[PDB]
Amino acid sequence: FVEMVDNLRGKSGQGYYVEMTVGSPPQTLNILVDTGSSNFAVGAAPHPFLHRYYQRQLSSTYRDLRKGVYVPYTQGKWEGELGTDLVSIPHGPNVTVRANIAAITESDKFFINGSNWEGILGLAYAEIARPDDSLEPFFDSLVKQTHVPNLFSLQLCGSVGGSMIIGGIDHSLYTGSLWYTPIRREWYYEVIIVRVEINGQDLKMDCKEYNYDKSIVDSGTTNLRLPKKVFEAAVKSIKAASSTEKFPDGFWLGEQLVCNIFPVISLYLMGEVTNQSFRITILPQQYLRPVDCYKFAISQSSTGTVMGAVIMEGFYVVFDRARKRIGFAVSACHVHDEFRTAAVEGPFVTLDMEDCGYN
Numbered sequence: 001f002v003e004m005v006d007n008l009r010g011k012s013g014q015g016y017y018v019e020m021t022v023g024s025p026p027q028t029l030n031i032l033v034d035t036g037s038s039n040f041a042v043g044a045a046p047h048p049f050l051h052r053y054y055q056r057q058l059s060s061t062y063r064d065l066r067k068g069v070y071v072p073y074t075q076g077k078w079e080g081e082l083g084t085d086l087v088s089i090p091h092g093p094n095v096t097v098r099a100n101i102a103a104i105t106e107s108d109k110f111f112i113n114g115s116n117w118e119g120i121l122g123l124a125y126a127e128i129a130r131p132d133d134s135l136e137p138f139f140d141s142l143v144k145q146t147h148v149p150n151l152f153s154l155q156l157c158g159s160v161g162g163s164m165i166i167g168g169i170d171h172s173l174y175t176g177s178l179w180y181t182p183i184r185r186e187w188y189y190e191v192i193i194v195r196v197e198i199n200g201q202d203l204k205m206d207c208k209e210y211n212y213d214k215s216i217v218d219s220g221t222t223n224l225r226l227p228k229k230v231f232e233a234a235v236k237s238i239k240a241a242s243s244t245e246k247f248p249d250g251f252w253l254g255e256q257l258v259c260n261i262f263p264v265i266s267l268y269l270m271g272e273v274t275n276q277s278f279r280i281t282i283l284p285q286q287y288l289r290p291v292d293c294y295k296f297a298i299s300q301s302s303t304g305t306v307m308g309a310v311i312m313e314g315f316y317v318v319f320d321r322a323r324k325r326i327g328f329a330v331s332a333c334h335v336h337d338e339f340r341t342a343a344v345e346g347p348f349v350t351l352d353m354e355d356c357g358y359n
């Protein structure tokens with residue numbers, strides 16, 4: 001998997017993209033790697049922000065599905081025309097598959113002005129695919145049509161770079177051992193957090209709060225998002241541990257910027273074995289992001305916990321779809337200092353972990 005190493009590029013806060021080819025002859029596009037969605041959607045019209053776009057008229061292998069798709073998000077929206085075409089990943093496996101492609105024809109607050117990507121690769125499951133679950137996601141098409149193993153792994157390094165290893169794991173990308181947490185349900189990459197520690201101090205909350213209404217691993221989100229009740233308890237603990245310096249209330253709410261004092265954040269995840277868990281620890285270097293101007297990258301959420309780039313940049317993350325599990329290991333590229341480092345530690349004894357999941 002040497003040729004797949006360093007195949008990700010991007011800019012801080014703008015996500016991580018991979019080079020892909022679409023159609024025949026192949027059209028080169030930069031595509032956002034997103035484990036928090038399930039559609040392969042690409043710009044297909046000359047939007048001013050786009051360096052390039054999918055030109056269906058130039059592709060002999062393009063097939064029209066004669067169906068539209070409208071996708072509104074919490075913020076922003078895109079509308080596309082559905083079809084299929086031959087797709088390949090130059091710095092991935094040496095294969096070409098026929099995959100569903102949403103040709104984006106209209107959008108608002110979707111593409112980022114100044115970004116170098118013009119499409120999105122939804123790596124999650126068909127359950128959250130749009131318009132419905134009958135539209136096969138790219139990775140499902142990839143596994144069905146080739147002998148590529150049903151697994152991919154991500155090393156996101158905090159302009160920015162990283163690696164997407166398709167069909168396997170590269171052991172040079174991590175130190176120590178991988179620790180696996182079960183995928184609760186195949187829609188998002190849903191996991192269960194069982195305990196949260198701020199500087200080794202437990203929040204003492206009902207663990208069901210940590211996963212209300214869900215907890216997901218999402219490469220297409222910058223922040224570590226937490227449920228409001230968990231967020232206000234977490235922020236209060238972070239306020240106390242950094243009592244040396246005083247910061248405005250707007251800073252903690254992500255309404256303003258700030259220009260050893262900050263605590264580590266540990267998330268205990270459900271293990272592979274009954275009553276067994278493991279913990280992942282992130283540093284201030286992960287949740288205090290440069291914009292020296294810094295933005296507090298922990299925010300309140302209405303859709304549950306989102307383990308975004310804040311979490312993922314500290315670790316090598318294995319999306320083991322074949323075994324319905326997600327592996328975490330200390331990243332060989334994560335940003336740290338001489339006193340503290342990101343950690344993956346286990347095993348720990350945690351009881352009533354099934355009560356933490358919301359139904």
Ligand SMILES: Cc1noc(C)c1[C@@H]1C[C@@](C)(c2cc(-c3cncnc3)c(F)cc2F)N=C(N)S1
Nearest residue numbers: 013014015034036037073074075110218220221
């Ligand atoms: C769900 C959801 N609900 O409200 C919003 C906003 C979303 C996002 C949808 C999506 C598709 C998305 C992400 C980014 C991005 C931004 N910054 C760094 N990386 C990716 C973007 F620019 C545009 C996007 F459409 N990917 C996600 N995981 S979250």
